[PDB]
Amino acid sequence: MKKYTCTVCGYIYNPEDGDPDNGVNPGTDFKDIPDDWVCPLCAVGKDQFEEVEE
Ligand SMILES: [Fe+3]
Numbered sequence: 001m002k003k004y005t006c007t008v009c010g011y012i013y014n015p016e017d018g019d020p021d022n023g024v025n026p027g028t029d030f031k032d033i034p035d036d037w038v039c040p041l042c043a044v045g046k047d048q049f050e051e052v053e054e
Contacts, residue, residue, distance in 0.1 A: 003052040004030045009042035012052065 001015035
């Protein structure tokens with residue numbers, strides 16, 4: 001699965017880690033994160049995130 005980055009504050013969502021404190025378990029693909037989830041650091045929504053392609 002791919003890593004996504006918050007383009008506002010640079011936080012990186014890593015699907016291996018998830019975001020367990022806010023209910024996103026390890027192994028969750030970004031597309032499957034509930035759409036009301038917000039960046040843990042700057043609180044912007046998913047629509048300001050982009051795939052980390054390489
Ligand atoms: Fe952010």
